[model samples]
Target: GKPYISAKDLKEIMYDHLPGFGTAFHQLVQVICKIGKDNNLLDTIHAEFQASLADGDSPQCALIQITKRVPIFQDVPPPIIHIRSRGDIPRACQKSLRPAPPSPKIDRGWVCLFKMQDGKTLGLKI
Candidate 1:
């Protein structure tokens, strides 16, 4: 069921999911990544569901699920999707501490997706 939800119908889920979190679709990734890393998660992948704003297919299964459950964003515009670089995160985080390596930057992007409507908007997680 989970895999189907993630891989099959993310857009429908995102429509319902976005409002519940009180955020858009892009900002969600940032919040998810931060919390995932903070909690020492091995992978911090997130998705936008609404790929019309980006490229690729189905966004990302891992990222989609991660953002949906978190719902860390509220009252923000659609954010531009971008990858974070290792240089952005703290030095210590790059190393290993809690079994999983630190990942302040996933996919080496910098605000890849931005809110086209508002430009200054944010994307909510879940």
Candidate 2:
């Protein structure tokens, strides 16, 4: 059986009665609406919200948790997009970005290791 309130309706209700927290509800709406019943994500979110409310958590906490659960709110795994801008780099990463030195010439005594267990070897130039 479906729940009494559709996610759209719940979002509308939030907008109506919870004006101050509009942004959170808006993001919630965006996430649930996009999920559109796949993997029962929306239902899970609604059930979680209800459970939070029943457990004596404040509306703000419930909403915050719900927003946090949404895919939009969750962090996107890296390699999807990268930020090269200096401002986007965290302090630790910025500090670690030292100037790279030139590639060392193939010097004397440069014994390259090879996978000899498979009886495979390749020539190396020093």
Candidate 3:
């Protein structure tokens, strides 16, 4: 019942669960915070799901299963992730989670993740 299939398993899962991750894993906290904050995960997922849930032409599942989309990303070098506003998304996973807040100069309404080739992940609040 895993949600992702990555290049490596444990290391990937390790990152996936850090809802609040290391600063080295910064900028991730906002993604989950904005969408799932106020204990509204189910509210968000269910809200979107129902909208897309008509089998006649509908489907969805984002809250609990919002992390990642591990595909062989060999084609897109530096396949960076981000959020809306031209919208981009980052899957900051370790065990599974989301996050990030804002600051003065760092005024961001959303966050993003970077898929670096060095086995280290990066994020930004945009």
- Which candidate should be chosen as best, given lDDT against the real structure? 2
Better candidate number, 1 or 2, judged by lDDT: 2
* Model 3 global lDDT (CA atoms, 0 to 1): 0.32
lDDT of each: 0.33, 0.41, 0.32
Per-candidate RMSD, Å? 15.7, 18.7, 15.0
User: What is the per-residue lDDT of model 1 for residues 3-114, given as tens digits with 9 covering 90 to 100?
Assistant: 2233123334444433333232333344444444445332222233333335544434435444444333222222334334334323422322121122222222212232
User: What are the clash counts of all predictions, listed in order?
Assistant: 27, 0, 23
Better of 1 and 3 by TM-score: 1
80 Cα displacement, candidate 1 (Å): 20
TM-score of 1: 0.25
Worst 10 residues of 2 by lDDT: 104-113
Q: Cα RMSD for candidate 2?
A: 18.7
Expressed as tens digits, the lDDT of each residue in 13-108 for candidate 3 is: 334644444432333333343333333343333333333333332121222123222111111222245333311232433322223322211122
The most accurate candidate by TM-score is: 2
